[PDB]
Amino acid sequence: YIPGRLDGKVALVTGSGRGIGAAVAVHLGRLGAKVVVNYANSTKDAEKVVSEIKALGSDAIAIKADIRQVPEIVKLFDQAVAHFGHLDIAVSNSGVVSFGHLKDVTEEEFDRVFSLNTRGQFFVAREAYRHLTEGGRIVLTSSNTSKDFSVPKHSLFSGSKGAVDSFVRIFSKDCGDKKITVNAVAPGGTVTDMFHEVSHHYIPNGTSYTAEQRQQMAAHASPLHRNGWPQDVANVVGFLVSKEGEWVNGKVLTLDGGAA
Amino acid sequence: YIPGRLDGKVALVTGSGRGIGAAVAVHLGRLGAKVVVNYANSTKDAEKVVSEIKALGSDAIAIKADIRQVPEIVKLFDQAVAHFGHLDIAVSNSGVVSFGHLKDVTEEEFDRVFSLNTRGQFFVAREAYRHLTEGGRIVLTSSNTSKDFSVPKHSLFSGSKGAVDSFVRIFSKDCGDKKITVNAVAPGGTVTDMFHEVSHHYIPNGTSYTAEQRQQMAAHASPLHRNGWPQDVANVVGFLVSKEGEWVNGKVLTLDGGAA
Ligand SMILES: [Cl-]
Ligand SMILES: [Cl-]
């Protein structure tokens, strides 16, 4: 046994087709876990993640699922256990962002967001509980916008993550009967491909700045004067799913480099 | 003008067919508001509330809606404004309770809860924003279980209210452009008809006590050594929707008599 490591463990990571999820999947592999790379869209992209994990010396497989469809969540977890023999760790990075003043939010938009961010993650947790070995780990994704950061025209997404915060605290009570801990990570300002698409929403008069000015301003929000990156989130997930993270249970950790 | 009073104001209250909502509707009437008594089921019951409000000296009307159906929310608010001329105050008491270990929660149950408690209340807020006069008030219902009280096998309901907490903080930003404040009340231990139905869920080995033993134990949870009652919640809503409550905005007030 090596401390911090996940040798002999099997992990499943959702949302591995975006920046954070992909960094998480690779990092659990680097730590010694075999990894089920779950993803929603590009199979080519997901196989690149599998390939990285294999190059590091750990085994991996890509299994697709639409997390909006609960029957596909069931099949994903069944297939995970059938392929690797058991499952110890489940990490959800499944989510979509949304912006708009309350007055303009449609039924369709509310459902698009909640079906994945809140309902999807709830049922990922349910299937993880059902499938996990005793002493396992569940981590969901919240956001600094849930409690710690107030963005106008961001009510729908903020609420979708406030639900997750409450879920994890109570999930820890129920999942204790299998000695599984349940936590969430709540990232702030993480730079990925898609950050520059939406960075204007987060500051007054955002569209009057360049993408680079907006990235630099977000950097200054942390007193460390750098942006958050997918690896910053992966580093914390890695500790939570380790043996040494056990006594953190039922909690949401805001990961914004000290901004709040 | 009399301080604390709502003379000349018009209020709409949802869930007026249950204990808390009914006490709220009557109390806003007592404070001088004309009241739209919105309810989900028994028309006879709702007309009893109308009659009380009329006996106190204020006007009232019962308008039914299924708050799960967004088109019915639109019609409710249209009919409210058509009947009284304008609308100043909207209070949602719409919600259903649910219990069960995560492992057993169905798709159908998740949808039953979230459709009313979270989605329904979100769209009540949207329609209130659209219809309210400048300087108005919106109050939604959360729960002590959202953040302040952890009950095993209560994840679904707890999460449905965690969403509302986040909603109101951001709603206050958007609704500020009409000078409307937005808050939530988060009641604990409130005794009504239906409390005795579920009081066993809230204590270890709950079914081995009588209903009266369970009510007495809940009474002792507050350091004031009494139960919470619908009037306790009404008293606070009444202050929030008054002129004097204006500087409380974007907040969730836990109303549990000091239990947490
Ligand atoms: Cl993905
Ligand atoms: Cl009702």
CATH code: domain of residue A163: 3.40.50.720
Q: Is-contact A107 A123, C-beta < 8 A? A: no
Q: Name the 3-class secondary structure at A181.
A: strand
Q: What type of residue sits at position A201?
A: H
Chain B nearest CA to A51, separation (Å)? 34
Q: Name the 3-class secondary structure at A92.
A: coil
Q: Is-contact A62 A47, C-beta < 8 A? A: yes
Measure the CA–CA gap between B216 and B199, rounded to whole angstroms: 11
Q: Name the 3-class secondary structure at A46.
A: helix
Structure tokens at B201: 């869920």
Q: Which of B145, B152, B166 sits opposite A162 (nearest CB)?
A: B166
Listed residue (A237, A38, A17) closest to A139, CA to CA: A237
Q: Do A129 and B103 touch (CB under 8 A)?
A: yes
User: Resolution for this model in angstroms, one decimal place?
Assistant: 1.9
If one counts every other C-beta atom within 10 angstroms of the C-beta of residue A7, the result is 11
How far apart are the CA of B205 and the centre of ligand 2, in A? 31
Chain A nearest CA to B186, separation (Å)? 14
**Residue-range definition of the domain harbouring residue B105:** 1-260
Residues of A in contact with B164 (CB under 8 A): 159, 162
Cβ neighbours of residue A139 closer than 8 Å, sequence gap 6 or more: A90, A91, A92, A182, A183, A184, A185, A237, A240, A241
How far apart are the CA of B14 and the centre of ligand 2, in A? 7
Q: Which of B102, B110, B130 sits opposite A119 (nearest CB)?
A: B110
Q: Do B102 and A146 touch (CB under 8 A)?
A: no
Give, in order, the Cα–Cα distances in Å from B98 to each of B93, B104, B152, B218, B235.
16, 12, 12, 19, 26
Q: Which of A103, A160, A173 sits opposite B152 (nearest CB)?
A: A173
Number of Cβ pairs closer than 8 Å across A and B? 127
Structure tokens at B239: 């202050």
Which of 169-208 (A) contact B at CB < 8 A?
A: 169-171, 173-175
Q: Is-contact B159 A152, C-beta < 8 A? A: no
Q: Name the 3-class secondary structure at A137.
A: strand
Strand intervals (E) in A52-171:
60-64, 89-91, 137-141
Mutate to test the interface with B, among A106, A124, A170 (most CBs of B within 10 A): A170
- Residue where the block lists tokens 């509980």: A129
Taking the Cβ of residue B110 and every Cβ of chain A, the question of whether any pair is shorter than 8 Å is answered with yes
Listed residue (B8, B179, B6, B10) closest to B80, CA to CA: B10
How far apart are the CA of B93 and the centre of ligand 2, in A? 8
Give, in order, the Cα–Cα distances in Å from B79 to each of A256, B12, B36, B87, B146.
46, 11, 10, 10, 33
- DSSP notation for chain B: --TT--TT-EEEES-TTSHHHHHHHHHHHHTT-EEEEEESS-HHHHHHHHHHHHHTT--EEEEE--TTSHHHHHHHHHHHHHHHS---EEE----------GGG--HHHHHHHHIIIIIIHHHHHHHHHHHPPTT-EEEEE--TTTTT---TT-HHHHHHHHHHHHHHHHHHHHHGGGT-EEEEEEE-SB--TTHHHHGGGGSTTGGGS-HHHHHHHHHHHSTT-S-B-HHHHHHHHHHHTSGGGTT--S-EEEESTT--
Q: Is-contact A9 A34, C-beta < 8 A? A: yes
Q: Is-contact B26 B16, C-beta < 8 A? A: no
Crossing angle for the helix pair B121-131 and B155-175, nearest 10 degrees? 20
Residues of A in contact with B147 (CB under 8 A): 166
Q: In chain A, which residue's Cα lies nearest the Cα of B161?
A: A163
Torsion angle in degrees (nearest 10) through CA of B43, B49, B53, B54: 50
Q: Which of B125, B147, B166 sits opposite A158 (nearest CB)?
A: B166
Taking the Cβ of residue A107 and every Cβ of chain B, the question of whether any pair is shorter than 8 Å is answered with yes
Residues of B in contact with A152 (CB under 8 A): 170, 173-174
Q: Is-contact A163 A183, C-beta < 8 A? A: no
Chain A nearest CA to B82, separation (Å)? 20
3-state helix, strand, coil in chain A (%, to 5): 50, 15, 35
Q: What type of residue sits at position A99?
A: F
| Exposure b/e, B89-128, CB count within 10 A at least 16 = b | bbbbbbbebbbbbbeebeeeebeebbebbbbbbbbbbbbb
CA atoms within 13 A on the CB side of B85: 5
Expt. technique: X-ray
Q: Which of A155, A166, A173 sits opposite B162 (nearest CB)?
A: A166
Which of 139-168 (B) contact A at CB < 8 A?
A: 145-147, 150-156, 158-167
Q: Is-contact B183 B253, C-beta < 8 A? A: yes
Measure the CA–CA gap between A68 and A204, rounded to whole angstroms: 33
- Residue where the block lists tokens 């708050």: B67
If one counts every other C-beta atom within 10 angstroms of the C-beta of residue A210, the result is 9
Chain A nearest CA to B130, separation (Å)? 6
Measure the CA–CA gap between B22 and A91, rounded to whole angstroms: 44
Measure the CA–CA gap between B31 and A77, rounded to whole angstroms: 56
Work out whether the CA dihedral A123, A126, A128, A131 comes out positive or negative.
negative
Radius of gyration of chain A (CA): 18
CA atoms within 13 A on the CB side of B32: 12
Q: Is-contact A181 A241, C-beta < 8 A? A: no
Structural domain count, chain B: 1
Q: Is-contact A51 A76, C-beta < 8 A? A: no
What's CA A228's distance to the chain center, in Å? 15
Q: Is-contact A80 A36, C-beta < 8 A? A: yes
Measure the CA–CA gap between B165 and B118, rounded to whole angstroms: 10
Measure the CA–CA gap between B15 and B73, rounded to whole angstroms: 13
